[PDB]
Amino acid sequence: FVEMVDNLRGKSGQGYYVEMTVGSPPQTLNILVDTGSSNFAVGAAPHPFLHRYYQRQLSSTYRDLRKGVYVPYTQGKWEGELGTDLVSIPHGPNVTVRANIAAITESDKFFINGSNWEGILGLAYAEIARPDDSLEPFFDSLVKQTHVPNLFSLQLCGAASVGGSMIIGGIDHSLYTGSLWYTPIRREWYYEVIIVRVEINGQDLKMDCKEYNYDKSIVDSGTTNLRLPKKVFEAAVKSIKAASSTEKFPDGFWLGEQLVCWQAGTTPWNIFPVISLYLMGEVTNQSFRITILPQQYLRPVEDVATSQDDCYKFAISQSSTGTVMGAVIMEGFYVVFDRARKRIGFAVSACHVHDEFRTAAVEGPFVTLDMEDCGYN
Ligand SMILES: Nc1cccc(CCc2ccc3cc[nH]c3c2)n1
């Protein structure tokens, strides 16, 4: 798996991408790694933001499926034409697979001006595939057509430029310390999990756990932030504000409507509480917890033109679609998407930013009853 170490690249806020090749002869593209969606979709036309795009005309192995797809977002979208073609990962397993590809022919607020990726690799399951669950995701084709074990793992670092590793088909023990703890995948659509308890600092929010998972909690490498359902975010924030009354900040800040700023090197790791999420464990009445630092939910904004300071954004925010454990969470940890056993494994990352005060942790077992009542139906 040393071929796969350090195979991911990126920039803050702009996601992590992996080099892939498509068609014959191979066309190299940088492809965003997205555990929050299930389509392999690539730029197929000379949009001005794009360094590179898929040229189907150059590929002997391309096959048209004669259907389009239309994928809405909030004031954003992409749209494309379906086909299949031969796909490889240069710094991944030593295989070539015929995959579905959405050739993106029109988009809105999808591609990022200034980024170095040109497509997206949806790594979640068929159920949330578009246009319907009959379009087989890349990873399902990969596993079905080769002897690659049905799992992958991600170490997202972010040291500006960020880096990491996507280990396809296995686990690399050099990427973590201590033990892996596993939480069941509740349903195979998103990588859905159940949060059973939340502690800001050690002290707990004391709210119906069912709310922590209203209507979803998912693990998503394509989201930057820890996102919390409105009611839990409300209480979430309420406690973070009090945890940190030491120094005042505006109301807009907590809603991600204003950046916060201190001068160079001018925050001493302390005014902010840790956050521990207790996840459902593999055994009845057993949970474990993962613990992150504010040097994870407080993220530098890469480059603000109207300032010269350490202007961090607040990486917690609200949702009508549920909890989202994005890069804020995953950058603390090595995360194992153990598809074969329907579980997600968490361990302390060998690359997470720490010091000799506080430190990201994965700990268990804890005793938690009624962990199923935490899931929404
Ligand atoms: N998982 C997820 C949620 C919302 C949208 C997407 C599409 C892929 C994507 C677009 C833009 C950015 C910026 C940072 N990460 C992404 C991922 N996927």
CA–CA separation, 261 and 44 (whole Å): 40
Give CA 271 to chain center in angstroms.
27
Question: Rounded to 5 degrees, what are φ and ψ at 141?
Answer: -65, -35
> Ligand 1 pocket by C-beta < 6 Å: which residues?
14-15, 32, 34, 36-37, 120, 220, 222-224
DSSP class of 248: -
Domain boundaries 149-377, corresponding CATH code? 2.40.70.10
- Say yes or no: do domains 16-148 and 149-377 share a fold: yes
Q: Which residue has the tokens 């938690």?
A: 368
Homologous superfamily of 16-148: Acid Proteases (2.40.70.10)
Active-site residues, by number, are 34, 220
CA-nearest of 129, 79, 99, 131 to 29 is 99
- Cα(325) to centroid(ligand 1), Å: 13
CA-nearest of 170, 182, 198, 159 to 327 is 159
Which of 11, 17, 34 best tests ligand 1's pocket when mutated (most atoms within 8 Å of CB)? 34
CA-nearest of 277, 291, 283 to 369 is 283
How many CA atoms does the CB half-sphere of 299 hold within 13 Å?
Answer: 27
Contact 336, 171 (CB under 8 A): yes
CA–CA separation, 353 and 332 (whole Å): 8
Parallel, antiparallel or unpaired: strands 316-319 and 226-229: parallel
Here the tokens at position 101 are: 């590809």
Here the tokens at position 17 are: 């991408």
- Cα(6) to centroid(ligand 1), Å: 21
- Looking at ligand 1, which atom is closest to the CA of residue 223? 15
Q: H-helix or E-strand containing 31?
A: strand 27-34
- Cα(356) to centroid(ligand 1), Å: 34
Query: Resolution (in Å) of the shown entry?
Result: 2.2
Sign of CA dihedral 244, 232, 256, 36: positive
Parallel, antiparallel or unpaired: strands 16-22 and 8-11: antiparallel
- Cα(206) to centroid(ligand 1), Å: 32
Count of other CB atoms within 10 angstroms of residue 37: 21
Domain ranges, ordered by start, for the chain: 16-148, 149-377
Contact 300, 209 (CB under 8 A): no
Q: Which residue has the tokens 């990588």?
A: 191
Q: What angle do CA 256, 200, 316 make, to 5 degrees?
A: 20
Which of 31, 32, 113, 219 best tests ligand 1's pocket when mutated (most atoms within 8 Å of CB)? 32
Residues ending a continuous segment of the chain before a break (C–N > 2.5 Å): 159
b/e map of 134-160 (b: 16 or more CB within 10 Å)?
ebbbbbbbbbeeeebeebbbbbbbbee
Question: Rounded to 5 degrees, what are φ and ψ at 59?
Answer: -115, 115
- Looking at ligand 1, which atom is closest to the CA of residue 73? 5
